Design a binder for this molecule. Structure first.
Ligand code: HEM
Ligand code: HEM
Ligand code: HEM
Ligand code: HEM
Length: 107
């Protein structure tokens, strides 16, 4: 695999950009997020052409907003789905990991 980035990286939408840190996710398997595509591994950007390249729609497989924020029923784990399970076990982190304002994603 390539080396994991050692600094936070940009995740751009149509209007806002959020910084993603790999360090706190050191014990999550790479494949949980960089999922297989047509049975092969890939570390391309999520919003790459032919991937989740619709930067304005809020629903649908092709929407980057949806694959990031949807709370349930998906084929792979979204950022908000996993963070909601962590907050049930560590409720002190609710606003940092799930808030829409003043959180670690949208400070
Ligand atoms: C597991 C150790 C693992 C590896 C390896 C890895 C690599 C990696 C690379 C090479 C990039 C840069 C992509 C580029 O082409 O610029 C990258 C970026 C993102 N990653 Fe990652 N990553 C590993 C693990 C994880 C885990 C566990 C998750 C989810 C919690 C995750 C997520 C992301 C995200 C988001 C990005 C940014 C993509 C974008 O569209 O900007 N990585 N990773
Ligand atoms: C970048 C790390 C990235 C993320 C994040 C991500 C998430 C993701 C989710 C949550 C789903 C399920 C959506 C649903 O159930 O409606 C999902 C599904 C697909 N993905 Fe994805 N995805 C990331 C990376 C990439 C890349 C680099 C591509 C293009 C090669 C891509 C494509 C797809 C496709 C196609 C699907 C639908 C079928 C499936 O495998 O579930 N994703 N992704
Ligand atoms: C989806 C790409 C996604 C994002 C975005 C994301 C962000 C994120 C941040 C900003 C933090 C806080 C770290 C800090 O304050 O420096 C954080 C922390 C944790 N996350 Fe996350 N995360 C995304 C995805 C996922 C997934 C899919 C999981 C679970 C499979 C996950 C888990 C965690 C955990 C655990 C932490 C640390 C919590 C703690 O106990 O301190 N994240 N994430
Ligand atoms: C709380 C549920 C919450 C809301 C609501 C929210 C909104 C939001 C918007 C409107 C954007 C901009 C869309 C665009 O520019 O196209 C956006 C972008 C991102 N968000 Fe978000 N968001 C909420 C919560 C969180 C949390 C807790 C995290 C981190 C786990 C997070 C992450 C992201 C990421 C990544 C982006 C950029 C990619 C994209 O969705 O286009 N959000 N958010």
């Amino acid at each position: 695999a390539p080396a994991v980035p050692n600094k936070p990286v940009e995740v751009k939408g149509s209007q806002k950009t959020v910084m993603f840190p790999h360090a706190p996710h050191e014990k999550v398997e790479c494949v949980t997020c960089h999922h297989l595509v047509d049975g092969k591994e890939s570390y391309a950007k999520c919003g790459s052409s032919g991937c989740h390249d619709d930067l304005t729609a809020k629903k649908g497989e092709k929407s980057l907003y949806y694959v990031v924020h949807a709370k349930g029923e998906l084929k792979h784990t979204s950022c908000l789905a996993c963070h909601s399970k962590v907050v049930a076990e560590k409720p002190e982190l609710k606003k940092d990991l799930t808030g829409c304002a003043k959180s670690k994603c949208h400070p």
